Amino acid sequence: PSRKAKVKATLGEFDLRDYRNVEVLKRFLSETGKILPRRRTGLSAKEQRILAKTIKRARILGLLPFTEKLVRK
Amino acid sequence: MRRYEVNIVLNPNLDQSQLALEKEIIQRALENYGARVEKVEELGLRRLAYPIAKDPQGYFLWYQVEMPEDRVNDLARELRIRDNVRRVMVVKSQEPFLANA
Amino acid sequence: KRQVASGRAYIHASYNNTIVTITDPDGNPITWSSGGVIGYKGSRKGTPYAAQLAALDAAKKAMAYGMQSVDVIVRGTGAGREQAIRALQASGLQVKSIVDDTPVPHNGCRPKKKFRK
Amino acid sequence: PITKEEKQKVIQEFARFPGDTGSTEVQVALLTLRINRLSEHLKVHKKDHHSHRGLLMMVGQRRRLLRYLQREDPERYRALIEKLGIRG
RNA sequence: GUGGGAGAGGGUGGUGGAAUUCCCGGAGUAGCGGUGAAAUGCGCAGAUACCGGGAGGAACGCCGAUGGCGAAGGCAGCCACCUGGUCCACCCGUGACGCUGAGGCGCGAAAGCGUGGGGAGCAAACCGGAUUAGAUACCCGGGUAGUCCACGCCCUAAACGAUGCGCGCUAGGUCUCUGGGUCUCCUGGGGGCCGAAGCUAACGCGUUAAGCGCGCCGCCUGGGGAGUACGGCCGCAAGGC
Ligand SMILES: NC[C@@H]1O[C@H](O[C@H]2[C@@H](O)[C@H](O[C@@H]3[C@@H](O)[C@H](N)C[C@H](N)[C@H]3O[C@H]3O[C@H](CO)[C@@H](O)[C@H](O)[C@H]3N)O[C@@H]2CO)[C@H](N)[C@@H](O)[C@@H]1O
Ligand SMILES: NC[C@@H]1O[C@H](O[C@H]2[C@@H](O)[C@H](O[C@@H]3[C@@H](O)[C@H](N)C[C@H](N)[C@H]3O[C@H]3O[C@H](CO)[C@@H](O)[C@H](O)[C@H]3N)O[C@@H]2CO)[C@H](N)[C@@H](O)[C@@H]1O
Ligand SMILES: [Mg+2]
Ligand SMILES: [Mg+2]
Ligand SMILES: [Mg+2]
Ligand SMILES: [Mg+2]
Ligand SMILES: [Mg+2]
Ligand SMILES: [Mg+2]
Ligand SMILES: [Mg+2]
Ligand SMILES: [Mg+2]
Ligand SMILES: [Mg+2]
Ligand SMILES: [Mg+2]
Ligand SMILES: [Mg+2]
Ligand SMILES: [Mg+2]
Ligand SMILES: [Mg+2]
Ligand SMILES: [Mg+2]
Ligand SMILES: [Mg+2]
Ligand SMILES: [Mg+2]
Ligand SMILES: [Mg+2]
Ligand SMILES: [Mg+2]
Ligand SMILES: [Mg+2]
Ligand SMILES: [Mg+2]
Ligand SMILES: [Mg+2]
Ligand SMILES: [Mg+2]
Ligand SMILES: [Mg+2]
Ligand SMILES: [Mg+2]
Ligand SMILES: [Mg+2]
Ligand SMILES: [Mg+2]
Ligand SMILES: [Mg+2]
Ligand SMILES: [Mg+2]
Ligand SMILES: [Mg+2]
Ligand SMILES: [Mg+2]
Ligand SMILES: [Mg+2]
Ligand SMILES: [Mg+2]
Ligand SMILES: [Mg+2]
Ligand SMILES: [Mg+2]
Ligand SMILES: [Mg+2]
Ligand SMILES: [Mg+2]
Ligand SMILES: [Mg+2]
Ligand SMILES: [Mg+2]
Ligand SMILES: [Mg+2]
């Protein structure tokens, strides 16, 4: 599936290397804390690769979750 | 010398005098390790994803800086000495990278 | 003799059994039940039916404490996981919410041979 | 690492004329630079082999260029070696 | 040379969360566990299930790929320091300085050896429970060396693309990683699929040749005996060549 929308489309211009922008990055995580695949994020190889890094940085800083409890269900 | 970003996270519970105390400790530790401070952003209290030392929030600090490379780790070590100091990270600065520019 | 009346329901579901524990909102257990607490002995504890009876026994013992509504928390993937939830669904309890808390490693610990591959 | 001013300095030192970049002398100077810097790195980190292979290859190229120089113009060979303080 | 680029390439020091186990506390009770089914086992000295606090060892989920890097072995949380390779653009410098490489030397997964630490989980041997005609096994409960770190040995392998290295030449189509360009397209470097000519015993290969050529290295000469004997060399030993 993943045709609901792509993440890249919903956001405007923004800095991938910026690990401190929470509202931008949170859009790239699932219900859980997981980093979405490209078919979700709609990013490129290079892009996705930098995203992974900066998301992890944000995590260590405490701005982003490593994992999150699955609700509903 | 090279350009780094010093991210500091402190205890949300510090009063004013203790906060400025910690900040001055930071100024001094930076100067002594020879770090010239280019830009500073104090974000203060922010909610965190997970607790850090059982406290749900954290006090954020960002320092753009230029310092000798050899010293960096040492400085980092120094910064982590304080109890009030919760998290410390030091990043080589980078040109930004834009999607949908 | 507590009168909690609002609490958590932990469903721990393995392939070998199903354990319903019910606690106060701080997580401290009032009562619990399992497939083995129900009359079953052998493999049958890991049965959906066994899970149903476990859940209803637990829920009953809970309402005796005065329990009204629960927060369901499911750990483990096993048969009768969903049957446990569906059991509490109308137990005479309201189910306020369901969360899946099943623990996963970030890959730290080597599994038993049976689980490797 | 090696900053551009370090490079420029050793080039302007060993350049056969103004603007000489790739003559044998400058190539050997530069190789000697990276070599000695590497060897200093390998005093410590004695457990890093992947770099050590690099060192070997560098020595290879250098030895070959010095053999070439000794063949074509022995006087320049002696000059270069003396200046750099290698091979003996 | 200059200017740009991507990468789990390598070494050191820090560091982050999830999980397992163990310890303390709370709450709680009659089982937990495990299998085809059970049993051993654990549990009223209060386990299992739940919350909280703590300690430690190890491995890094999602990103993650038909992906990248490396000469190979191999390389995957994050950060900084150190460091090897490499590709593109400019067409600036040297002026054949090239290629290959017996021997030498260095590297070389796992297991194994020495010393000293470490030891959560897993686990050869082993101790039990099952199964079976028996079960020196598959299954279950335990569990030592080991797996981990440092230093030092060991030198093996389905160490595999079962395909030595370099260079030139011979249709294209398509997918992909990464440069540059006047960016629908052109142009490199890399990884894949189908396929011209051609090769091949066939399978298949096919600008990533197993095609057409040249240079150099290693190697083969029916099966068993046998990677054995002996000799030499290496090794602490196991043992290797
Ligand atoms: N992250 C540190 C790394 O440590 C490596 O090796 C180090 C680690 O193996 C180990 O560091 C400590 C150790 O002192 C202490 N006694 C126990 C602690 N658990 C270790 O830390 C490490 O343990 C293992 C690695 O074996 C990892 O799985 C774990 O994530 C990590 N925390 O001891 C070694 C010496 O410091 C390498 N030096 C290098 O990759 C890097 O510095
Ligand atoms: N491989 C290491 C990683 O390098 C990345 O960045 C690396 C590459 O992006 C960068 O490549 C540069 C290239 O830009 C520049 N134009 C030329 C330079 N020679 C290259 O560097 C390369 O060669 C040199 C030896 O000369 C090595 O020391 C170095 O490791 C290697 N990357 O060099 C960096 C250092 O290796 C990561 N950002 C860094 O965090 C990490 O250490
Ligand atoms: Mg059972
Ligand atoms: Mg060569
Ligand atoms: Mg790396
Ligand atoms: Mg833990
Ligand atoms: Mg207790
Ligand atoms: Mg007993
Ligand atoms: Mg706990
Ligand atoms: Mg290769
Ligand atoms: Mg750090
Ligand atoms: Mg000339
Ligand atoms: Mg050669
Ligand atoms: Mg020699
Ligand atoms: Mg080995
Ligand atoms: Mg080993
Ligand atoms: Mg020992
Ligand atoms: Mg075990
Ligand atoms: Mg066993
Ligand atoms: Mg047995
Ligand atoms: Mg039989
Ligand atoms: Mg028997
Ligand atoms: Mg040992
Ligand atoms: Mg060793
Ligand atoms: Mg293979
Ligand atoms: Mg191939
Ligand atoms: Mg290959
Ligand atoms: Mg472009
Ligand atoms: Mg490859
Ligand atoms: Mg044909
Ligand atoms: Mg085929
Ligand atoms: Mg083909
Ligand atoms: Mg191609
Ligand atoms: Mg052939
Ligand atoms: Mg032979
Ligand atoms: Mg042979
Ligand atoms: Mg014969
Ligand atoms: Mg014969
Ligand atoms: Mg043999
Ligand atoms: Mg012999
Ligand atoms: Mg001997």
Handedness of CA C18, C55, A68, A48 (dihedral sign): positive
Breaks in chain D (C to N over 2.5 Å), named by the residue before each, are none
DSSP state of B71: G
- Residue C94 has a CB neighbour count (10 Å cut-off) of 13
- Residue B88 has a CB neighbour count (10 Å cut-off) of 21
With a CB cutoff of 8 Å and minimum separation 6, the contacts of D54 are D38
Residue B100 to residue A13: CA distance in whole angstroms: 5
Tokens of A43: 């990013």
Tokens of D12: 């302007």
Contact status, residue D65 vs residue D31, Cβ threshold 8 Å: yes
Task: Give ion ligand 3 contacts, CB < 5 A.
Answer: C 16-17, 45
Tokens of C114: 């049976």
Who among residues 11-70 of D has its Cβ near strand E, under 7 Å? 11, 16, 19-24, 27, 30, 34, 37-38, 41, 45-55, 57-58, 61, 64-65, 68
Residue C38 to residue C51: CA distance in whole angstroms: 9
- Resolution in units of Å: 3.4
Name the CATH superfamily, with its identifier, for domain C1-117. Ribosomal protein S11/S14 (3.30.420.80)
Tokens of D46: 């004695």
Residue C15 to residue A25: CA distance in whole angstroms: 37
- Burial string for C37-47 (b: 16+ CB within 10 Å, else e) reads bbebeeeebbb
Residue C17 to residue C15: CA distance in whole angstroms: 6
Residue A22 to residue B93: CA distance in whole angstroms: 18
Residue C76 to residue C72: CA distance in whole angstroms: 13
Q: What is the DSSP string of B17-54?
A: HHHHHHHHHHHHHHHHTT-EEEEEEEEEEEEEEEEETT
- Total residues found in chain A within this entry: 73
Residue A46 to residue C86: CA distance in whole angstroms: 46
Experimental approach was: X-ray
Separation of D56 CA and E104 C1' (Å)? 15
The Cα-based distances of A54 to C47, C63, C107 in angstroms read 45, 49, 21
Output the domain CATH number for residue A43.
4.10.640.10
**Domains defined for chain B, CATH in brackets:** 1-101 (3.30.70.60)
Beta bridge partners of C94: C69
DSSP state of B69: G
With a CB cutoff of 8 Å and minimum separation 6, the contacts of D77 are D66, D69, D70
Say how many domains are in chain A.
1
**Which ligand has an atom closest to residue D50 CA?**
2
Residue B56 to residue B44: CA distance in whole angstroms: 14
In three-state form (DSSP H/G/I as H, E/B as E, the rest C), the secondary structure along chain C is CCCCCEEEEEEEECCCCEEEEEECCCCCEEEEEECCCCCCCCHHHHCHHHHHHHHHHHHHHHHHCCCCEEEEEEECCCCCHHHHHHHHHCCCCEEEEEEECCCCCCCCCCCCHHHCC
Is there contact between A51 and strand E, defined as CB under 7 Å from any strand atom? yes
DSSP state of A65: -
Contact status, residue C72 vs residue C45, Cβ threshold 8 Å: no
Q: What are the CB-based long-range contacts (under 8 Å, 24+) for C40-47?
A: C43/C16, C45/C16, C45/C17, C45/C18, C46/C14, C46/C15, C46/C16, C46/C17, C46/C18, C46/C78, C46/C79, C46/C80, C47/C79, C47/C80
In chain D, where the domains are located? 1-88
Separation of C113 CA and E133 C1' (Å)? 30
3-class secondary-structure state, position B95: coil
Nucleotides of E under 7 A from a protein CB: 1-3, 6-20, 26-39, 48-54, 57-65, 67, 70-73, 77-85, 92-98, 106-108, 120-124, 139-141, 151-152, 176-179
Among the partner residues C99, C104, C106, nearest to A73 by beta-carbon distance: C99
Tokens of C88: 């509490």
Query: Is A61 within 8 Å of B52 when comparing Cβ atoms?
Result: no
Task: Kindly tell me whether chain D and chain A come into contact, counting contact as 3+ Cβ pairs under 8 Å.
Answer: no
Tokens of A22: 């929470």
Separation of B36 CA and E1 C1' (Å)? 34
Burial class of residue B91, CB neighbours in 10 A (0-12, 13-18, 19+):
middle
| CATH top-level class of D1-88 | mainly alpha
Residue that is written with structure tokens 């892009």 in the block: A47
Smallest CA-to-CA distance from A46 within A66, A16, A20 is with A16
The amino acid present at D48, given as its one-letter code, is: D
Residue C111 to residue C102: CA distance in whole angstroms: 16
- Dihedral, C59, C60, C63, C68 alpha carbons, nearest 10: 40
Task: Kindly tell me whether chain C and chain A come into contact, counting contact as 3+ Cβ pairs under 8 Å.
Answer: yes
Contact status, residue C54 vs residue C38, Cβ threshold 8 Å: yes
The amino acid present at C96, given as its one-letter code, is: K
Domain hosting A42: range is 1-73
Cα(D28) to ligand 12 centroid in Å equals 19
Who among residues 20-59 of C has its Cβ near strand E, under 7 Å? 21, 23-24, 26-32, 34-37, 41-46
